[PDB]
C-alpha cells in the first residue's frame, strides 16, 4: 500500500544528524526502492567518497506500524513519511549505525532540483526531532 507508494526512483537531496558526518559523500546516484513481496523495501544507492563508488543495499523489514521498518538486523529503526511538499518524503532513523548510535534524517524527492520549500520543512522536522541543524545538501549524478 505505502511500500508500493514510495517504490521507484528518488533523489537523496538533504541529510542531517545528531552526531558527526563520517566519510560524508561527494556525490550520490539516484536512490532506488523496490517493493518486495511481503512488504519489505530494497533500497540501493551508489555514492562517491574519495574516488570510490560504494554500492549500498539496505533491506527495510516491515513492522506492524505504518511507516516503521527495521534494518541492520533490527538495530536501526527507520521511519518513512511524506513531505507536505509534493513529490517529497522524509526518512527518519535512529539506532546504531556502524559502532555508534547516530540519530539521522534524509530528504527524498522525485526530481533532483532542490526545493527551498521542501528544505524548510526538512529543517523544521529535523530541529524538532533534535539535530545539529546543519542541513547538508548533496551533489547528484546519474552514474558514478
Amino acid at each position: 500500500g505505502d511500500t508500493v507508494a514510495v517504490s521507484g526512483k528518488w533523489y537523496l537531496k538533504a541529510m542531517t544528524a545528531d552526531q558527526e558526518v563520517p566519510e560524508k559523500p561527494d556525490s550520490v546516484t539516484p536512490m532506488i526502492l523496490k517493493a518486495q513481496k511481503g512488504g519489505n523495501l530494497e533500497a540501493k544507492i551508489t555514492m562517491l567518497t574519495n574516488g570510490q563508488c560504494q554500492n549500498i543495499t539496505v533491506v527495510l523489514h516491515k513492522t506492524s506500524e505504518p511507516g516503521k521498518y527495521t534494518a541492520y538486523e533490527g538495530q536501526r529503526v527507520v521511519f518513512i513519511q511524506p513531505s507536505p511538499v509534493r513529490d517529497h518524503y522524509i526518512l527518519y532513523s535512529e539506532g546504531e549505525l556502524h559502532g555508534r548510535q547516530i540519530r539521522m534524517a534524509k530528504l527524498l524527492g522525485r526530481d533532483p532540483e532542490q526545493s527551498q520549500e521542501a528544505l524548510e520543512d526538512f529543517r523544521e522536522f529535523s530541529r524538532a526531532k533534535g539535530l545539529n541543524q546543519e542541513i547538508l545538501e548533496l551533489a547528484q549524478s546519474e552514474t558514478c
Partner: antibody
Amino acid sequence: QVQLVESGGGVVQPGSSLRLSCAVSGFTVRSYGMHWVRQAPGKGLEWVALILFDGTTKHYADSVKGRFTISRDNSKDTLYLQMTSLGAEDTAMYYCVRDFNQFVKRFVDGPAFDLWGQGTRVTVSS
Amino acid sequence: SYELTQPPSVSVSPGQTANITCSGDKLGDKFTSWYQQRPGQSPVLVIYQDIERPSGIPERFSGSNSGNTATLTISGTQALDEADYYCQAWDTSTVVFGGGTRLTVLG
C-alpha cells in the same frame, strides 16, 4: 494512443544479423523496464532480454547471451534488439513489452507486462 | 534453470469453473503474473502480483499463490475464455514463463 509497435523482421540466412525496433506511443520509454519476448510457431512464450529504467541494467536469456544486446533511443521513443549469429532456434514472433511494475514512480519485484506489440516475425533459414 | 510447470491442457464445459496451475520451487515467495493468448494474437495480462486484476479484465478471473503452486481460476467460464494461458515470475536476473496451458471450452 498508448501502444508498442515492432518492425524489422523478415527472412535471413543463418549466421547473419538483424536489428529489431519497437516504436512506443503514449509514454516515455526510459521511464520503464522494457523487455523482448518471443514465441516460435506452435510453442510457448520465451523471454529474451530486458533493460531497466536505469538504462544501464541488462539481462538476457542464457540462450542468447553474447549474441544479443537490447537498447533504447529515448529521443526516438524506440527500443532496439540487436541480434547476431542467428540460428534456426531464433525463428519466432518477437514482441516488445512494458513492465508496468518497473517504473520511475512504481517498482515492485514482480514483472507485469501490460503492453504488448502485435509482433514482428523473424525467420532464419537458407 | 528455474522452471514453471503447467499442465499442457485443460477442458471445461461452458459455465464450469476452470482451474489452471503453475508449479515451481517456493513459487509462493514470488509474485506471479498470468497472460491470456487467443490464436493469432498478442498475449493479454489477466493477473499480476498473484491476485490483482488490470482493468478491462472480468471478475470471473482470479489468482492465488501458495507454497509451490499458483492457480488461475476462471469461474463461469465463457466460450471466449478459450485461449492459451501462461504463468510468469522473476527468479534471478531471469524472467520465466511456464509452458502454457490450452484451456478448451467444449463446443
